[PDB]
Design a protein around this ligand. Structure first.
Ligand SMILES: c1ccc(C(OC2CCN(CCCCNc3ccc4nncn4n3)CC2)c2ccccc2)cc1
Length: 173
């Protein structure tokens, strides 16, 4: 219930850093990465995994999890580290979407912030612009919605503990 957390700066020489840096740079190589940290929130993680286990048991062969990007402002970083992303929350397939100044707002020092997030996209459908929760597939609903079902570029998650902000990327132009 507390959801306290630790923030650990990864070594650039760490394979985990390289993995995260590399996905970022598939579309954001022209930005400069200042650092990458891992967010360690035990409580938030178990709640996330609980829902994942529940989703795993219900969606058959579906690979319910994706690692997506989320741009946010500097000030929200503490709130997200603790509460995650609890009219849902939007995640990008490609980091250059999230890197836009509208989402990863540059702070007074010029730093921009993008989370590399584990998201339970689960089973999704095309999303219209007027959803508080996902529509019905009965009364059982989709897990997320997307701009395009075959070639997605963003997802929208609507429930608590459906995303974990595993890594934060601090970077600049
Ligand atoms: C007609 C139809 C729908 C509406 C509105 O519904 C949605 C439209 C704006 N959406 C925000 C999208 C921002 C992108 N979000 C990110 C944010 C970080 C980020 N990092 N990487 C990617 N992203 N995407 C959500 C709500 C509405 C709004 C308020 C009240 C009522 C209705 C209005 C008129």
């Amino acid at each position: 219930k507390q959801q306290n957390f630790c923030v650990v700066e990864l070594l650039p020489s760490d394979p985990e850093y390289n993995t995260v840096a590399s996905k970022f740079n598939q579309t954001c190589s022209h930005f400069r990465i200042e650092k990458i940290e891992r967010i360690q929130n035990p409580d938030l993680w178990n709640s996330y995994q609980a829902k994942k286990k529940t989703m795993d048991a219900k969606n058959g062969q579906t690979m319910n999890e994706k690692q997506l990007f989320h741009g946010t402002d500097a000030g929200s970083v503490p709130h997200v580290n603790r509460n995650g992303f609890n009219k849902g929350t939007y995640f990008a397939v490609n980091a250059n979407y999230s890197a836009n100044d509208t989402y990863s707002r540059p702070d007074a020092n010029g730093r921009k912030h993008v989370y590399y997030v584990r998201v339970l996209t689960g089973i999704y459908t095309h999303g219209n612009h007027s959803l508080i929760v996902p529509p019905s597939k009965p009364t059982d609903l989709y897990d997320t919605v997307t701009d395009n079902v075959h070639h997605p570029s963003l997802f929208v998650a609507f429930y608590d503990y459906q995303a974990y902000p595993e890594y934060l990327i601090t970077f600049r132009k």
